[PDB]
């Protein structure tokens, strides 16, 4: 087997963890995978041939990716139904639902914790940029939280995440590394607002207006100005002026070791 295959008979389902557009994610016990262990099992609903292709293709890419801050892929089973993709279990779920339930609405995550969360997401994004891979949908809803506040990028995939997109992506549909930094800036903003929807008051069309008009999201209260500088560096009008995710990660890593 070329991509790793996980036998259905080795997967015992425990309970549902959550729902995506694609279908369902369960907690499972997986027997004989590393020398029983808990795993997350993504199970596809669609069952068609177009979707079965995309699923295989995703498994094909993901077997080759491997990083401390990308969710660990274990294998696939595409012969049979539902189509299964198995990953490491991150018990605290998605980063957006986590921020919202660990903020003011132990107490809220402290500044240093927020900077650790930001730094981990950024680290994942340096791996992707270095691979010349464009995510296109970086958002806190697409990140996962493990025990002990380990955070990893959890998902890689017309519907558009318009509030996270820069002007040039809204207008010209150009997705690059530098549009991913833009989205990262908005991720920073989500982190420091404890999971708020960017431009939440506004409707989608009003959000587009603001983004296209050059209007920046406000500095969150929990957000020190040096972090807001980082946001603004992600939010330059011209893509080539925008900071590298590498610079962005370094700056946050430095900030997280000796916080202001």
Ligand X SMILES: CC(C)Oc1cc(Nc2nc(N[C@@H](C)c3ccc(F)cn3)ncc2Cl)[nH]n1
Closer to a copy of itself at the Cβ: 226 or 246? 246
Q: Is the CB of 52 or the CB of 219 nearer to ligand X?
A: 52
Range 97-116, binding a copy of itself (CB under 8 A):
none
What part of residues 146-185 is at the interface with ligand X (CB under 6 A)? 154-155
18: which 2 tokens?
């959550």
Q: Which stretch binds Zn ion (CB under 5 A): 64-72, 120-128, 129-137, 168-176?
A: 129-137
Task: State yes or no: residue 42 binds ligand X (CB under 6 A).
Answer: yes
Q: From CA 228, how far away is CA 233, in angstroms rounded? A: 9
Q: Is 20 annotated as a binding residue?
A: yes
Q: Is 137 a catalytic residue?
A: yes
CB 125 within 8 A of CB 245: yes
Question: Is residue 254 close enough to count as binding a copy of itself by CB under 8 A?
Answer: no
Among residues 137, 155, 180, 247, the one annotated as catalytic is 137
Distance of CA 226 to the CA centre of its chain: 23
Q: Which stretch binds ligand X (CB under 6 A): 83-91, 101-109, 232-240, 244-252?
A: 83-91
Among 13, 20, 60, 246, binds ligand X (CB under 6 A): 20
**Is 246 annotated among the ligand-binding residues?**
no
| Residue 40 site contact among Zn ion, ligand X, a copy of itself, none (CB < 5 to 8 Å, cut-off depends on kind) | ligand X
Nearer Cβ to a copy of itself (170/222): 170
Q: What are the residues whose beta carbons fall under 8 Å from the beta carbon of 190, sequence distance 6 or more?
A: 96, 99, 139, 140, 196, 198
21 is in an annotated binding site: yes
Annotated binding site for ATP: 17-25, 42
Question: Under the rule (CB under 5 A), what is the footprint of Zn ion?
Answer: 2, 19, 77, 79, 132
Active-site residues: which are they?
137
């Amino acid at each position: 087997a070329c991509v790793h295959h996980i036998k259905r008979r080795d997967i015992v389902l425990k309970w549902e963890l959550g729902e995506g557009a694609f279908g369902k994610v369960f907690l499972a016990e997986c027997h004989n995978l590393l020398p029983k262990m808990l795993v997350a099992v993504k199970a596809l609903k669609e069952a068609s041939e177009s979707a079965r292709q995309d699923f295989q293709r995703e498994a094909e890419l993901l077997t080759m990716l491997q990083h401390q801050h990308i969710v660990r892929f274990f294998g696939v089973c595409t012969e049979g139904r539902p189509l299964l993709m198995v990953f490491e279990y991150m018990r605290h779920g998605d980063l957006n639902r986590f921020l919202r339930s660990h903020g003011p609405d132990p107490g809220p995550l402290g500044l240093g914790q927020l900077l650790a969360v930001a730094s981990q997401v950024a680290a994942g994004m340096v791996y992707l940029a270095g691979l010349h891979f464009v995510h296109r949908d970086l958002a806190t809803r697409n990140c996962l939280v493990g025990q002990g506040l380990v955070v990893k990028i959890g998902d890689f995939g017309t519907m558009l995440p318009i509030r996270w997109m820069p002007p040039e992506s809204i207008l010209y549909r150009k997705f690059t590394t530098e549009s991913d930094v833009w989205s990262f800036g908005v991720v920073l903003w989500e982190i420091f607002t404890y999971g708020k929807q960017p431009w939440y008051q506004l409707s989608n069309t009003e959000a587009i207006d603001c983004i296209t008009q050059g209007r920046e999201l406000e500095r969150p209260r929990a957000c020190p100005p040096e972090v807001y500088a980082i946001m603004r560096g992600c939010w330059q009008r011209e893509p080539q002026q925008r900071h590298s995710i590498k610079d962005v990660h370094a700056r946050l890593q430095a900030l997280a070791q000796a916080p202001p």
